[PDB]
Design a protein around this ligand. Structure first.
Ligand SMILES: NC(=O)C1=CN([C@@H]2O[C@H](COP(=O)(O)OP(=O)(O)OC[C@H]3O[C@@H](n4cnc5c(N)ncnc54)[C@H](OP(=O)(O)O)[C@@H]3O)[C@@H](O)[C@H]2O)C=CC1
Ligand SMILES: NC(=O)C1=CN([C@@H]2O[C@H](COP(=O)(O)OP(=O)(O)OC[C@H]3O[C@@H](n4cnc5c(N)ncnc54)[C@H](OP(=O)(O)O)[C@@H]3O)[C@@H](O)[C@H]2O)C=CC1
Ligand SMILES: CCCCCCOc1cccc([C@H](SCC(=O)N(C)O)P(=O)(O)O)c1
Ligand SMILES: CCCCCCOc1cccc([C@H](SCC(=O)N(C)O)P(=O)(O)O)c1
Ligand SMILES: [Mn+2]
Ligand SMILES: [Mn+2]
Lengths: 411, 411
C-alpha cells in the first residue's frame, strides 16, 4: 500500500538525495513508487535516472532537449513512459491521480510555479525550495486556504526540525502556512540553527576580499551553487527566518538565529510553558526528505546512529550582523512585510549570481540588496489570486532589474 | 474548569516545587485547585502549607503527630478541612471524586503504596517517585492493565523529557508502563542524560575517601538526602535506566547513559528512522511537574527563557563504570529481571543510608549491593495481584536485612 511520489529537480542536490533515501528505504521494504522525474536540461542524467527508476512520467523543462530525451529513452527496453516538456508537462504531472506527494527540489523563484500547481491539485508538497515561500508567502497561504487537502511539508532542514518538534495531535488540527498555527501548537519562540558557513571566523578585512571559490567549499555534501553562496553570506538564514514566519506563524521578534557550527541540533521550538524541544542528527538531508514523505508516521532506516559521546561538544553563538549584514536585511524586509520579501529574494538572486561569477565583492551583495529594498515602495495587495501572482511576478522582475542596474551603474 | 490536584509528600523537595509552580501558574490564571496535602511527620510545615493553600483534605502519616496537627489547624479561622491520618487517610484521599491528579513526591519504596492506590482509583498519577517503578514495575503494569483510565505521567526529569519528546497522537493510542509502547511510538533507543553528580572528576584514590558531606553539596536546588546520595554514586541513574525500561518498554541494550554536566538537554529519544528528539531547559523540576499536570496540553508560564548563546557549550561523555560501578549493577539487575530490581533498590536503600550516616565508604555501597544481588535467586512471579505485592514486600525486606547483615558482619 505504497507512496506514489514525484521528484521535481531530480538531478540536483535535493533530488539525488531524495532518490537515494528512497532507494535505501525500498531495500528494507517497498514503500515508495517513483512515479515522475522532472528536470530543466540535464537530459543525460535524467536518462540515467529513468533507466534505474523507470517512472511512469518524465519531463524536461527545456524544449530544446526534448527530442534528445525521447531519443535516449528509446534505448531503455520494455519501458514506455509518458515523456513531457515544459510548464505543460509539469501541470499534467501535478494533475495525475497516480501521484500523492511531490518533492520540490527546484531552485530559486522558479520553484514557485510547480509549488503552486502542486497545491492547486491538492497534493502533499514536500517543499525544499524556500524562495517560493519567501517570495509568495501570502499567496501560498491563500491557495492553501482554498485547497483544503493540499499541504506543505517542510524539507528545509531547520523547518523539518521545527515541524518534527511539534505534537502531531495539534498539527493535525491545522497545517503549515496557516493563520493561528503557532497558537494551536502552543509555539512561543524559535531557535533557528545555522552552520555559520565557511566565513564564520574571518575578520572584516578578510571578508572584504573573499571569493566565490572560497565560498563554494561547503563541507559535508554538495549543494547547489546558489544555496552554497547564500550559506556563505548567511542570506540563506535570512531567507529561512522569513520562511519560518510563514510556515509556522511566528513573529519575527520570536525567531532567533543561533550559529551552531557542529550542525547536530537542527533547530529548536520553545513552547508557551518555556519547555524547549529540538531535533537532532548528523548534518544531513535524508531525514528531512524522508520525514516529509512519511509524516505523520516514521519508518525504519539503517542510517548511522547519532553518538553523543562521539560528538562530545555542541556550541552556540550569536552571528555578527556587521559580518553578516544579509541577516539584518532579511529581518527588516520580513518585518516591513508587503512585497519586501519578494524584493529581498529577487535582489539577492542577482547579487548572489554576480558574486558567484566574480563580478562583485562580498559586501557589495548586501549593499545592492539594501539599495533595492530602500528603493521599493509598498503596494496594495491584489485581492484576486491570479492578479496577486502577476503582481508578485512584476515586483520580482523589477527588483532583479534594479539590482542589475545598480551593478551596471557602479561599473 | 480547573484541575483538582493532590500533593503527596508536600513538604519535601518535589512537593514544595510542585506547590511553587502551582502558585505561579495560578497568578497567570486559576487552573489548579490544591485539594489535598499529605506528609509523614512535618506537622508544623504542613500546618503552614494548610494556612496558605486551604485544601479540602490534610493527612499526616505519623499517628503520633495527628492530634498536634488537629490542634494547629484550629488556629486557621473559617477553614474546616478533613484531617486524616495514616494509610487509611491516604486511601480515603485516593478515593475522592474531587481529585483528578495525584503528585507522588514521597521518597523510597514507601512511595509505592500511595502510587498503587492512586492507580486503583483510576487517577492520573504524576509520579516523581522512581523506587516504586524499579521495585514493582511488573506489578504496576498489571494494575494499569486492569485500571484502564489510570495513567502514570512521569515527573522524573529525564522521563518527563522522554515523554515530552513523543508524539501525543501516538501516546494517546496507549499509555506509559504498557507492553508495546515503544512499538506504538516508533522508539528505537534512549539517551538518558546525567548531571554526573559531584564526584564526576575525582580519581579512584579520591573516590575511595569521599564522605556524605562532600556528596550532599548538589548545585542547583535542594533535593532530598536520598536522591542526593544516589546522584553522587550514579545509582540514581542506574535506577532511572530500569525506570526507563518499564515506563517506555525499551530494552536495556537500547538505553545509553550519557553524562551531560550542563543539564540543559534533559534526555533524548531516537526514533526508528534514527531522527533524534530531545527536551531542553535549565536544570529544574518545575517544567516536569507542570507538564505532568497539563499533559496532553501546555499552559503559559513566566519561567526564565532558555538562552542558547548564554549556555554557549554543551558536553557529553560516557560515565566510567569503574568509578561508578552502581550503574553496571543496575543494568545487570535489570537484564536479569525477575525481582532483581527489587533487590537492587532495597539493598541500595540500606547502603545509601549507611554512607549518609558515615558508617561505610563509597566503594562499600557497590560492594554491598553487588553481594546482595549475588545472593538472590529468582522466584516464580505470583499470578495473583495481592500475592505479587506480598512477594515484592518480602523480597524488599529480605534484601534490606541482607544488606544490613553484610554491613554488620564486616563490623
Ligand atoms: N541542497 C540542499 O541540501 C538544500 C537545498 N534546499 C533548497 O532546495 C532547492 C534546490 O536546491 P539544490 O538541490 O541545492 O539545487 P541544485 O542546483 O543542486 O538543483 C536544482 C534542480 O532544479 C532543477 N531545475 C531548475 N530549473 C528547473 C525547471 N524550470 N524545471 C524543472 N527543474 C528545474 C535542476 O535541473 P537541471 O539539473 O536540469 O539543471 C536541478 O535538478 C533550493 O530552493 C534550495 O534552497 C534547501 C535545503 C538544503
Ligand atoms: N528532589 C527532586 O528534584 C527529585 C526527586 N525525585 C524523586 O521524588 C521522590 C521524592 O524525593 P524528594 O522530594 O527529594 O524527597 P524529600 O526527602 O525531599 O521529600 C520526601 C517527602 O515524602 C514525605 N513522606 C515520607 N514518608 C511519607 C509517608 N509515609 N507518607 C506520606 N508522606 C511521606 C515527606 O514528609 P515529611 O516532610 O513529613 O518527612 C516529604 O514530604 C523520590 O522518590 C525521588 O527519587 C525525582 C526526581 C527529582
Ligand atoms: C560536518 C561539519 C559541518 C557540516 C556543515 C554542513 O552544512 C550545513 C548544515 C546545516 C545547515 C546548513 C545551511 S545551508 C543548507 C540548508 O539550508 N540546509 C541543510 O537546510 P546554513 O549555513 O545556512 O546554516 C549548512
Ligand atoms: C547548574 C549546574 C548544574 C546543576 C546540577 C543539577 O542536578 C541535576 C540535574 C539533572 C539531573 C540530576 C540527577 S539527580 C536528580 C534527578 O533525578 N532529577 C532532576 O530528575 P543525576 O545526577 O542522577 O543525573 C541532577
Ligand atoms: Mn536550511
Ligand atoms: Mn531524574
Amino acid at each position: 500500500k505504497p507512496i506514489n511520489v514525484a521528484i521535481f529537480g531530480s538531478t540536483g542536490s535535493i533530488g539525488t538525495n531524495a532518490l537515494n533515501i528512497i532507494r535505501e528505504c525500498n531495500k528494507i521494504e517497498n514503500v515508495f513508487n517513483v512515479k515522475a522525474l522532472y528536470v530543466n536540461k540535464s537530459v543525460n542524467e535524467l536518462y540515467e535516472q529513468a533507466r534505474e527508476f523507470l517512472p511512469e512520467y518524465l519531463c524536461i523543462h527545456d524544449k530544446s532537449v526534448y527530442e534528445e530525451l525521447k531519443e535516449l529513452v528509446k534505448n531503455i527496453k520494455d519501458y514506455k513512459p509518458i515523456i513531457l516538456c515544459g510548464d505543460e508537462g509539469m501541470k499534467e504531472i501535478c494533475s495525475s491521480n497516480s501521484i500523492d506527494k511531490i518533492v520540490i527540489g527546484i531552485d530559486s523563484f522558479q520553484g514557485l510555479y510547480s509549488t503552486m500547481y502542486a497545491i492547486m491539485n491538492n497534493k502533499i508538497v514536500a517543499l525544499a525550495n524556500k524562495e517560493s515561500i519567501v517570495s509568495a508567502g501570502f499567496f501560498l497561504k491563500k491557495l492553501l486556504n482554498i485547497h483544503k487537502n493540499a499541504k506543505i511539508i517542510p524539507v528545509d532542514s531547520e523547518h523539518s526540525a521545527i515541524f518534527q518538534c511539534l505534537d502531531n495531535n495539534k498539527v493535525l488540527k491545522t497545517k503549515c502556512l496557516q493563520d493561528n498555527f503557532s497558537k494551536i501548537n502552543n509555539i512561543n519562540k524559535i531557535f533557528l540553527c545555522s552552520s555559520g558557513g565557511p566565513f564564520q571566523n574571518l575578520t572584516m578585512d578578510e571578508l572584504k576580499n573573499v571569493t566565490s571559490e572560497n565560498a563554494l567549499k561547503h563541507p559535508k555534501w554538495k549543494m547547489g551553487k546558489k544555496i552554497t553562496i547564500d550559506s556563505a553570506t548567511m542570506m540563506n538564514k535570512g531567507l529561512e527566518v522569513i520562511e519560518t514566519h510563514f510556515l509556522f506563524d511566528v513573529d519575527y521578534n520570536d525567531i532567533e538565529v543561533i550559529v551552531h557550527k557542529e550542525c547536530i541540533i537542527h533547530s529548536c521550538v520553545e513552547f508557551i510553558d518555556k519547555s524547549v524541544i529540538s531535533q537532532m542528527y548528523y548534518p544531513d538531508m535524508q531525514i528531512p526528505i524522508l520525514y516529509s514523505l512519511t509524516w505523520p508516521d516514521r519508518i525504519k532506516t539503517n542510517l548511522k546512529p547519532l553518538d553523543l559521546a562521539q560528538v562530545s561538544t555542541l556550541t552556540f553563538h550569536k552571528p555578527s550582523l556587521e559580518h553578516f549584514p544579509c541577516i539584518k536585511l532579511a529581518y527588516q524586509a520580513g518585518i516591513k512585510g508587503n512585497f519586501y520579501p519578494t524584493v529581498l529574494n529577487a535582489s539577492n538572486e542577482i547579487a548572489n549570481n554576480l558574486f558567484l561569477n566574480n563580478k562583485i565583492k562580498y559586501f557589495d551583495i548586501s549593499s545592492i540588496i539594501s539599495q533595492v529594498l530602500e528603493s521599493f515602495n509598498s503596494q496594495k495587495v491584489s485581492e484576486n489570486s491570479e492578479d496577486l501572482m502577476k503582481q508578485i511576478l512584476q515586483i520580482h522582475s523589477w527588483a532583479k532589474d534594479k539590482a542589475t542596474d545598480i551593478y551596471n551603474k557602479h561599473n
